[PDB]
Amino acid sequence: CPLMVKVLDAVRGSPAINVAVHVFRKAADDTWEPFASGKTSESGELHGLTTEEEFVEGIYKVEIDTKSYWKALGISPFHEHAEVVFTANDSGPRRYTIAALLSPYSYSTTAVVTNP
Amino acid sequence: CPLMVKVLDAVRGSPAINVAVHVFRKAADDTWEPFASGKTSESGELHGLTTEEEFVEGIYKVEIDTKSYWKALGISPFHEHAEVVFTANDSGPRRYTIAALLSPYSYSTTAVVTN
Amino acid sequence: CPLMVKVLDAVRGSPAINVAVHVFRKAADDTWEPFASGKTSESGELHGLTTEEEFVEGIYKVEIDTKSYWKALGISPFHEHAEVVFTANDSGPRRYTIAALLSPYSYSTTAVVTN
Amino acid sequence: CPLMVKVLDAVRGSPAINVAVHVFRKAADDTWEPFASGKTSESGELHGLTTEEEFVEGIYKVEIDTKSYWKALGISPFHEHAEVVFTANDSGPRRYTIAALLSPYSYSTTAVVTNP
Numbered sequence A, D: 001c002p003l004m005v006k007v008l009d010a011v012r013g014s015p016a017i018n019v020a021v022h023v024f025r026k027a028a029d030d031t032w033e034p035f036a037s038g039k040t041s042e043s044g045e046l047h048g049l050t051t052e053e054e055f056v057e058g059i060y061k062v063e064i065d066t067k068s069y070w071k072a073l074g075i076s077p078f079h080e081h082a083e084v085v086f087t088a089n090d091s092g093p094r095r096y097t098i099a100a101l102l103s104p105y106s107y108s109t110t111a112v113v114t115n116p
Numbered sequence B, C: 001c002p003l004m005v006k007v008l009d010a011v012r013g014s015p016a017i018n019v020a021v022h023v024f025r026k027a028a029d030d031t032w033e034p035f036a037s038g039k040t041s042e043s044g045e046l047h048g049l050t051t052e053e054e055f056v057e058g059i060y061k062v063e064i065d066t067k068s069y070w071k072a073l074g075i076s077p078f079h080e081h082a083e084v085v086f087t088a089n090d091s092g093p094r095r096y097t098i099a100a101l102l103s104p105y106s107y108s109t110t111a112v113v114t115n
């Protein structure tokens, strides 16, 4: 699994479940092309977005749909989404975990990058 | 000052100085139109981006050029930039501070919205 | 103002107002001796804790009473309090700001140390 | 596993490996009694600190030795340690993950609490 997304809820102290995630990759014309999408499981994890073959070098954007998540809990949050933009695989294949910790008016994101 | 941006450095324990910041407003066709920009000061702050008259309700994006900041310090970073996307809403408090705390492989952002 | 404490609320997007803060200094027998305390202001800030003369090198602990803050808002929190423990060092920059961003099950803290 | 500690490094984008962790429990006389200790593995996780039987109701302090961690990387950090203090098991047994994300002058901690 070359790209995994994990989302946690800082209000409830739990995984953030059923969070929609859309991944985009910058094309040669500088536009953001849809790359993969999914939603977090009961563990707050999203697996299976892509494959080693498909996940080539590029600039990727991981958009985490935080607003939809919060509204369903009765909270009117600040942000539209959390966006995470990074260059991937420019020194060869790596495995990326993109993690996000969510609050209604704040979020934090970190990456764990490992070499297979 | 309806919109202020503040940036801090979690590696050095300091304001993040001379960081480029660009603000965009979402247009009717869903594209991002340049709205305001500047560089953070010695206190890590960027004031004077807009005025009450110009800062109407709508969706805004604040892009913070974190990659260039880390590169200038000789530190290899993860993100191309930090992006903060939010709706300005007239019912809520009037002044928005978008703050960001930067590390090479992580960032955190919060909004302080007050009267 | 060699030591300032600033507290923000990640749920409401606001300063954390009227939060009790206690500062302790580590004594020679390893016990924590009360040093200074106060409540955060309407801007989430606590100034005037100590003076240059009194704030000598040593290990300090800042305890932020987060549990009472959340309980007053009707929100069930995880932590008893947030604790920030650090060494004051004379070589470094002179003014210390200990900042904390609070959520019910999480908190983040940073130091901004400047001249 | 009723209590697990996970530590990540925000400078390197990796697990924080070999981080010492000491857990204390408040005694009846209000002193902090040593409860369990260990260090994080290659995954940044510390398992096996305690058992369901031993981990009774109480106020617990998880002290993560961040200063020692950073000095070994050549960084003179701000904090002595990160302390995480919480009441546990007061509504019956729960499973607790205490996570911490470390930078030289900052750290963030969150808890994931689940009901077995």
Ligand SMILES: O=C(O)c1cccc(/C=C/c2ccc(B(O)O)cc2Cl)c1
Pocket: A006, A008, A099, A100, A101, A108, A109, A110, C106, C108, D006, D097, D099, D100, D101, D108, D109, D110, D112
């Ligand atoms: O505190 C922040 O700023 C922060 C930011 C972004 C992510 C995280 C959480 C990471 C995490 C990753 C995996 C597990 B796991 O179920 O083993 C648990 C946790 Cl908490 C914490």
Ligand SMILES: O=C(O)c1cccc(/C=C/c2ccc(B(O)O)cc2Cl)c1
Pocket: A108, B006, B097, B099, B100, B101, B108, B109, B110, B112, C006, C008, C099, C100, C101, C108, C109, C110, D108
């Ligand atoms: O993102 C985190 O994890 C984080 C952690 C700890 C503190 C902060 C906030 C810093 C701050 C400091 C001063 C002002 B100010 O009123 O000029 C505003 C802000 Cl938001 C953000």
